[PDB]
């Protein structure tokens, strides 16, 4: 089901510069030893393949321009080799590590979601994001939910899809196992077929993405 959502402390909108151009995405504060880690799509912080983003801003609980917990700047960005070197959609997930803001670590201010890797295929999910393309305008949190199924057409990426109306800008937004934003994150919004596709696909969170998380979370 597609719905409007009140802001969630740990879920945020991303504003970034990549390859010299300005874009938006969505992301999520995830549990990590550094208390500074944000999950998103690889394509939200790296050309895939190519350079990393030159500026990356995370705004937790963004609503209509408001930044109730401030604007957070990335100090480092981590994507798997398969993304950064090959642009492989199978591995379209990455993790940003944020600078402190006013002497505070992100997770201490907004909390964080637990993560899961190497889980079952075909789980049920609720996905969140800040869709920014018609009929949406990027200003507010939205969600989709459903049971994950395989990509019937391009199954070569091991991705999974759920019914969803979220558009460009929702990329990188978290997939939570179950029906709540309080759950474990286990994928991100990655792609759809066309600008207003009725299915959202997210990559399988396996060992490669886990390894990227592990390095980011300590950094």
UniProtKB/TrEMBL annotation:
Keywords: Hydrolase, Protease, Signal. Disulfide bonds join 25-44, 144-164. This is Serine protease. The gene is Spr. The keyword Protease applies. The chain holds residues 112 to 330 of 330 of the full protein. One of its GO terms (biological process) is proteolysis. The keyword Protease applies. GO terms for molecular function: peptidase activity.
């Amino acid at each position: 089901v597609n719905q409007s959502e009140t802001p969630v402390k740990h879920i945020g909108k991303i504003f970034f510069t990549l390859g010299g151009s300005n874009y938006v995405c969505s992301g999520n504060s995830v549990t990590a030893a550094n208390k500074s880690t944000v999950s998103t799509a690889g394509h939200c912080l790296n050309e895939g393949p190519g350079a990393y983003a030159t500026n990356f801003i995370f705004v937790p609980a963004y609503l209509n321009g408001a930044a109730p917990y401030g604007k957070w700047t990335a100090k480092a960005l981590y994507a798997p080799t398969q993304w950064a070197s090959n642009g492989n959609m199978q591995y379209d997930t990455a993790f940003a590590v944020m600078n402190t803001l006013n002497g505070q670590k992100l997770a201490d201010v907004v909390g964080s979601s637990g993560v899961q890797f190497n889980a079952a295929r075909g789980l049920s999910y609720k996905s969140f994001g800040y869709p920014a393309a018609s009929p949406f305008n990027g200003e507010s949190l939205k969600s989709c939910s459903g049971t994950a199924t395989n990509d019937p057409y391009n199954p070569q990426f091991a991705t999974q899809g759920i019914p969803c109306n979220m558009t460009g800008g929702s990329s990188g937004g978290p997939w939570f196992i179950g029906n709540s934003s309080s759950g474990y994150q286990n994928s991100v919004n990655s792609y759809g077929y066309g600008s207003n596709s009725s299915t959202m696909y997210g990559p399988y969170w396996g060992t490669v993405i886990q390894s990227t998380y592990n390095t980011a979370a300590a950094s």
